[PDB]
Amino acid sequence: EEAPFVIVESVDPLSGTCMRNTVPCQKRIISENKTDEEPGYIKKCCKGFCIDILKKISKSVKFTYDLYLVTNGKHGKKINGTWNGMIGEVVMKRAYMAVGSLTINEERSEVVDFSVPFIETGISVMVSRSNGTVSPSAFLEPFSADV
Amino acid sequence: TLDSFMQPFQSTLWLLVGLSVHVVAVMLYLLDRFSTLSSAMWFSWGVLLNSGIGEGAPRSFSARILGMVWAGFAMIIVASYTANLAAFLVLDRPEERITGINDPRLRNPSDKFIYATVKQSSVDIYFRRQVELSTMYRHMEKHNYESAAEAIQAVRDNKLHAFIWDSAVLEFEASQKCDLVT
Amino acid sequence: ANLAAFLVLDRPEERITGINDPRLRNPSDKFIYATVKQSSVDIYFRRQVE
Amino acid sequence: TGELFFRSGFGIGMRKDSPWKQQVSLSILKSHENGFMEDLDKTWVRYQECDSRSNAPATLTFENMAGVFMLVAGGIVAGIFLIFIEIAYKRHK
Amino acid sequence: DSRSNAPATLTFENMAGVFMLVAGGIVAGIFLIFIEIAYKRHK
Amino acid sequence: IVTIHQEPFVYVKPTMSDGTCKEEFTVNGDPVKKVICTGPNDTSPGSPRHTVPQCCYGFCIDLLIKLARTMQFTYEVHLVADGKFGTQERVQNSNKKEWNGMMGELLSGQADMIVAPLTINNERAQYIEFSKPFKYQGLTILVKKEIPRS
Amino acid sequence: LLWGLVFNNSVPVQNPKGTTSKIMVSVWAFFAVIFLASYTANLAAFMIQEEYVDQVSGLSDKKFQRPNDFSPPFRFGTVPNGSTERNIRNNYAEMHAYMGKFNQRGVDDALLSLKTGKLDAFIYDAAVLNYMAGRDEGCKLVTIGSGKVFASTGYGIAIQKDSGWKRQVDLAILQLFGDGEMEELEALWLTGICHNEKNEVMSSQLDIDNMAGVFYMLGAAMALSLITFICEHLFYWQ
Amino acid sequence: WVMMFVMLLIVSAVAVFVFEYSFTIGKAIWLLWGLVFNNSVPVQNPKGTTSKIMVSVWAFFAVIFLASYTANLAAFMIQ
Ligand SMILES: *[C@@H]1O[C@H](CO)[C@@H](O[C@@H]2O[C@H](CO)[C@@H](O)[C@H](O)[C@H]2NC(C)=O)[C@H](O)[C@H]1NC(C)=O
């Protein structure tokens, strides 16, 4: 789940399924470690930019699919030579493809295959707009020394 | 318009210009000792307030050029005072005024914005029929009203944020009640 | 007050808004635009029917 | 003027059967991370010259003085003529 | 009425910022008047 | 290597009478690294069809130098004959369809790599291979602007 | 006398006697009247076109590399376990070490901390940050510059290595760019409200940082006046 | 305008009362009118000490008066 690209919410209380223009994702739940239960899954609805890209792409290279949300990790991290998140799910052959806000870098490109990019990103800095203006010598701006 | 004194000038700025007039007056007192302590009190203030009070001109040649610069200081702050104020009167907040039916607040409705219409009317037929407005129709279905007198009243207070209705009816309401706009 | 208005008020400008500007969409013999022959820019226009 | 459309970037072209195609992509990805690509932009692209903006508030230059300082300067040459007339009028009447 | 610029003509609201200061100054001087006239004979 | 003339990325200048490239420095005094090219002179092969050595430098030239040092290869560069980026056309009433410009130089075995501002698209991707992008851009329009009042 | 008129006739003077002198004063008054009107009008214009400047130039700013030898030292951080943390670690060791005490746990949490003053800067992905900038309540949040990207990359689809679907997938992706569905998709999902084209709303209170120049000029004038007075007194002594 | 002319009358009466403790009545209104529209009219100042403070306060009022009028008048023309 990422706010503008993958948005997930619960199914219609009236019908118990997903609304139009959405896709179903199944999520897994883990109870307390003292005692756990047989497979427990919850059905959700997934929509967004990447979901629309996955829908058009799927209809012309012609394949069917099922979606599920990752539980261990968020995006991918190498700890003691092991990967988690979506990257780790793809490495363990548990998933075939990963769709979402995953950035292409050299470290991950040595363990999985990336396709051409569909949007450009990077690193940015966000600050709060300070109220007021800047004017150290505004009173000298009009006219010129010659006059 | 705020307070006239405090809007373009901070209270600390008044103190700095409030104390500097005495510093100039004290500076003229040093020229009297080396080569009138009441007359010159006035002169320094009179220049700031551009009033003809007092007739005490500086005596020393160096004292003459000190007040020569002092006249220019008063012109600068007064000119900046008028200039800044006009900028404040022209510039306004750009704000957000719902550009139209394609505004992102309507296409992707959150819980902080609620809009509706009248139940069982021709606006309901428009949204329900065509499939790319399904998200918008779902949001309005649980907030629609019974008559337009009620939806217009519910906009005067902040129980409703936007009302969609016929332009002929709505343009009349905007020209008779002043809170409302289309 | 007038001098101030004259120094900040500027004449309106056309400033073509992009590829959806009415001048480009409905072209005439008085306005001319072009590109480079045998470029990717040519492939883009020749392949969309709209 | 306007916004951007058809957003495709620049790549290196090779044949489908090349022993170099996998190493080129890894080197390009590595160069973006360590800042080598940002160095090239400063040297060849972002040095810039005459600047942007359209409103352009502008400092007033000497051109205004021509239409203003000429009158006072012309007043000086027109003052000595009135000087002789005034002083002579005291003697004449 | 319409328009978006809506240039607001200044009205009596600005008096409290300024008009009270001069009004206060009128009564602030008479207090010094009694002291000043006494100070002429006090020294 | 095949290259095209584009000022922000590729500069083409004539060689000195000696036969080498003139020395030049940046704003910080470090040398500008150039390479010896070979391509048609004057306008095009339309009339004076003969190649002469030239000097090349720019954004793309020094990126190729970085690639060669890391990947441990040696290169020779030249300019495209017709000065075109490349599109697919048909010739002399035939069923075949063949590329021209820089795209046809690589496909015909006259080149091994393309180091130039070449746009990645669907049509070119079905015959050649593209690497990850080293520049992200779009399309825009260039117009003229006038003078204000006085 | 004739220097008094140009500055709004502030100082008191004594009138001359000659008629031609009166004419000269009268013609100088016009010059001074026009001269001052022109000065104020321009001054107002400059302010209505004041433009803002970014507090930090970029990622290599002075406040980012050596934050200690600054007042109430600058506070900035990111949410760990991502690509941004990986890149800063391999390129700025001491900056990464300093960032350890300002770690966030979410984008909304980081925005809330930034609004309330608990944080001075946030470093994260460029694509999600530009989205949050245009959807904020008001337009209080901005990105440095006009939108600046460092270590440019993009979002892709991770596929199992040595698979046969990759060529079909990326060929299909390039086909969407040719048709133009990407513009429709970004208009439908990635459109924003706020504009970052240097709005420059308004200044206020004309703080001391603005009057520093005039105060310095007054101080310099006082210093030169006292120096000249001392020199004149010493010369008169001899 | 009348709300400030009434203060002209009040300040003139107050200054006349102060001068009791060559300043006539008409000269009071004349000088007090002079400051409102910039010091362009010759006048004669009242030697009264507190009257000097009062007229200084009036000058401070008049400065703000004229500056706001110019900013607003300018503003209409822009919009
Ligand atoms: C980043 O990853 C670390 C793991 O290396 C996370 O730390 C774990 O968090 C879980 C959840 O609270 C705890 O149960 C573990 O005990 C933590 N392990 C360690 C070693 O601290 C951390 O929460 C992650 N942070 C974010 C923002 O995702």
Ligand SMILES: N[C@@H](CCC(=O)O)C(=O)O
């Ligand atoms: N999009 C990033 C997460 C955000 C960030 O870490 O900067 C990733 O793919 O890991």
